[PDB]
Design an enzyme around this catalytic site. Structure first.
Site, PDB file in Angstrom:
ATOM      1  N   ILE A  48       0.781  -1.229   0.000  1.00 55.19           N
ATOM      2  CA  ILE A  48       0.000   0.000   0.000  1.00 55.19           C
ATOM      3  C   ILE A  48       0.819   1.289   0.000  1.00 55.19           C
ATOM      4  O   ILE A  48       0.295   2.365   0.292  1.00 55.19           O
ATOM      5  CB  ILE A  48      -0.979   0.008   1.198  1.00 55.19           C
ATOM      6  CG1 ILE A  48      -0.215  -0.126   2.514  1.00 55.19           C
ATOM      7  CG2 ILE A  48      -1.953  -1.154   1.070  1.00 55.19           C
ATOM      8  CD1 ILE A  48      -1.105  -0.219   3.733  1.00 55.19           C
TER       9      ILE A  48
ATOM     10  N   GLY B  75      10.618   2.961   5.181  1.00 56.24           N
ATOM     11  CA  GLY B  75      10.355   1.579   4.820  1.00 56.24           C
ATOM     12  C   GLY B  75       9.102   1.412   3.986  1.00 56.24           C
ATOM     13  O   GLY B  75       8.359   2.371   3.773  1.00 56.24           O
ATOM     14  N   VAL B  76       8.866   0.191   3.516  1.00 55.41           N
ATOM     15  CA  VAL B  76       7.691  -0.104   2.704  1.00 55.41           C
ATOM     16  C   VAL B  76       6.546  -0.625   3.562  1.00 55.41           C
ATOM     17  O   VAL B  76       6.755  -1.395   4.508  1.00 55.41           O
ATOM     18  CB  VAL B  76       8.008  -1.144   1.627  1.00 55.41           C
ATOM     19  CG1 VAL B  76       9.034  -0.569   0.643  1.00 55.41           C
ATOM     20  CG2 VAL B  76       8.526  -2.424   2.286  1.00 55.41           C
TER      21      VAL B  76
ATOM     22  N   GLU C 121      -3.010  -0.252  12.611  1.00 51.94           N
ATOM     23  CA  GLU C 121      -4.390  -0.531  12.212  1.00 51.94           C
ATOM     24  C   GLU C 121      -4.409  -0.138  10.741  1.00 51.94           C
ATOM     25  O   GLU C 121      -3.644   0.726  10.324  1.00 51.94           O
ATOM     26  CB  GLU C 121      -5.386   0.348  12.975  1.00 51.94           C
ATOM     27  CG  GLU C 121      -5.154   1.840  12.832  1.00 51.94           C
ATOM     28  CD  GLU C 121      -6.299   2.686  13.399  1.00 51.94           C
ATOM     29  OE1 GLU C 121      -7.447   2.599  12.899  1.00 51.94           O
ATOM     30  OE2 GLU C 121      -6.051   3.449  14.342  1.00 51.94           O
TER      31      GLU C 121
ATOM     32  N   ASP D 134       7.358  14.948  10.154  1.00 51.49           N
ATOM     33  CA  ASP D 134       7.289  14.703   8.722  1.00 51.49           C
ATOM     34  C   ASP D 134       5.870  14.557   8.176  1.00 51.49           C
ATOM     35  O   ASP D 134       5.598  13.669   7.374  1.00 51.49           O
ATOM     36  CB  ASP D 134       8.129  13.478   8.349  1.00 51.49           C
ATOM     37  CG  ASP D 134       8.284  13.313   6.841  1.00 51.49           C
ATOM     38  OD1 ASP D 134       8.240  14.320   6.113  1.00 51.49           O
ATOM     39  OD2 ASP D 134       8.454  12.177   6.376  1.00 51.49           O
TER      40      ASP D 134
ATOM     41  N   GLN E 163       0.384  11.963   2.192  1.00 50.47           N
ATOM     42  CA  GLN E 163       0.576  10.511   2.082  1.00 50.47           C
ATOM     43  C   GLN E 163       0.467   9.730   3.379  1.00 50.47           C
ATOM     44  O   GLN E 163       0.217   8.518   3.352  1.00 50.47           O
ATOM     45  CB  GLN E 163       1.922  10.192   1.398  1.00 50.47           C
ATOM     46  CG  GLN E 163       2.065   8.734   0.974  1.00 50.47           C
ATOM     47  CD  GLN E 163       3.392   8.434   0.306  1.00 50.47           C
ATOM     48  OE1 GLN E 163       3.795   9.119  -0.632  1.00 50.47           O
ATOM     49  NE2 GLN E 163       4.075   7.401   0.783  1.00 50.47           N
TER      50      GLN E 163
HETATM   51  N1  LIG Z   1      -0.376   4.933   1.608  1.00 48.91           N
HETATM   52  C1  LIG Z   1      -1.141   4.302   2.430  1.00 48.91           C
HETATM   53  N2  LIG Z   1      -2.383   3.856   2.031  1.00 48.91           N
HETATM   54  C2  LIG Z   1      -3.189   3.183   2.926  1.00 48.91           C
HETATM   55  N3  LIG Z   1      -4.356   2.760   2.581  1.00 48.91           N
HETATM   56  N4  LIG Z   1      -2.748   2.970   4.191  1.00 48.91           N
HETATM   57  C3  LIG Z   1      -1.516   3.403   4.618  1.00 48.91           C
HETATM   58  C4  LIG Z   1      -1.093   3.184   5.917  1.00 48.91           C
HETATM   59  C5  LIG Z   1       0.211   3.660   6.338  1.00 48.91           C
HETATM   60  C6  LIG Z   1       0.692   3.463   7.687  1.00 48.91           C
HETATM   61  O1  LIG Z   1       1.815   3.859   8.070  1.00 48.91           O
HETATM   62  C7  LIG Z   1      -0.138   2.789   8.628  1.00 48.91           C
HETATM   63  C8  LIG Z   1      -1.421   2.308   8.251  1.00 48.91           C
HETATM   64  C9  LIG Z   1      -1.920   2.483   6.917  1.00 48.91           C
HETATM   65  O2  LIG Z   1      -3.183   1.994   6.588  1.00 48.91           O
HETATM   66  N5  LIG Z   1      -0.718   4.074   3.716  1.00 48.91           N
END
Ligand SMILES: Nc1nc(N)nc(-c2cc(O)ccc2O)n1
Length: 294
Positions: A10, A16-17, A77, A123, A127
């Site tokens: 996502i 990190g990813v 979550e 930060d 996003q």
């Molecule tokens: N870009 C993106 N999209 C979605 N849908 N979710 C997230 C997300 C990022 C995080 O750090 C923690 C929970 C999350 O649900 N990040």
């Protein structure tokens, strides 16, 4: 991790990813972040751990912290969409004002909570602001910058955005105050209203110069101590400030008023989240439900 099952990727955070995963156990679906290095710092795994107690309805909940095989996994979550994606989707039409005001209101409550616990985000950006179908918006990656420290790019080759970076950071300040988060949020507020990033710098000096061109090159008058800052140069071009009526049209006077106090140069003068919550802008705040197409 053997417990989960990477459903999808996502996103690719700066630390990190992030993956969407289904827990083979609880079955619950969560967001799994794989952090970055020869074994990960020890003072880091202690800072992060403290954030598990920083619970708030407007802060993405950190479910777990797992340091295994010199790898760091943060379990959060899961929310279905981030603000950048929702804005791209709402650009042709623009996010309605009532929903913009509600999100800003909730983000400020989130910041107020973190800031009262002496925790800064450092930060903030579209996003990592997450929304759900029930009209809520939450702050993601809180406290990560503290534990770690934003490097050249990110965890890997990929430029970090500077568009939301407060001016004191760009001018080399050593200590950041909660005011840096207010600045970022003001930038995001302006972007939701105009459907265009406020200060889309593509380099540090470009970022700073974009801020100067719009808010005027800061001086000792509006910002005591600024000329004494590490990266300040007497050679900076001297730009005149532009009126906010031109910066975020057609936002109303209460809105422009709040934004102006969120973008004050002097961090000591910048409105706190707590105080922004009492601004006349939120006099008629409500909680509309967004239109999400998941
Ligand atoms: N870009 C993106 N999209 C979605 N849908 N979710 C997230 C997300 C990022 C995080 O750090 C923690 C929970 C999350 O649900 N990040």
């Amino acid at each position: 991790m053997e417990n989960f099952q990477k459903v999808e990727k996502i996103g690719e955070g700066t630390y990190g990813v992030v993956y969407k995963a289904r827990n083979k156990l609880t079955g619950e679906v969560v967001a799994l972040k794989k952090i970055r290095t020869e074994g990960v710092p020890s003072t880091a795994i202690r800072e992060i751990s403290l954030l598990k107690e920083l619970n708030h309805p407007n802060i993405v909940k950190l479910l777990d912290v797992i340091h295994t095989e010199n790898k760091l996994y943060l379990v959060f979550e899961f929310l279905h969409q981030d603000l950048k994606k929702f804005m791209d989707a709402s650009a042709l039409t623009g996010i309605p004002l009532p929903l913009i005001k509600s999100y800003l209101f909730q983000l400020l409550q989130g910041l107020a909570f973190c800031h009262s616990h002496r925790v800064l985000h450092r930060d903030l950006k579209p996003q990592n602001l997450l929304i759900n179908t029930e009209g809520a918006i939450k702050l993601a990656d809180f406290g990560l910058a503290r534990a770690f420290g934003v490097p050249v790019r990110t965890y890997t080759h990929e430029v970090v955005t500077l568009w939301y970076r407060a001016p004191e950071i760009l001018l080399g300040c050593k200590y950041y105050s909660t005011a840096v988060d207010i600045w970022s949020l003001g930038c995001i507020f302006a972007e939701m209203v105009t459907r265009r990033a406020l200060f889309p710098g593509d380099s540090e000096i470009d970022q700073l110069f974009r801020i100067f061109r719009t808010l005027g090159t800061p001086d000792e008058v509006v910002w005591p101590g600024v000329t004494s800052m590490p990266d300040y140069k007497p050679s900076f071009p001297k730009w005149a400030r532009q009126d906010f009526s031109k910066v975020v049209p057609p936002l109303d006077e209460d809105g422009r008023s709040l934004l102006s106090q969120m973008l004050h140069y002097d961090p000591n003068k910048r409105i706190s989240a707590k105080a922004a919550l009492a601004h006349p802008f939120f006099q008629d705040v409500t909680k509309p439900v967004p239109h999400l197409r998941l």
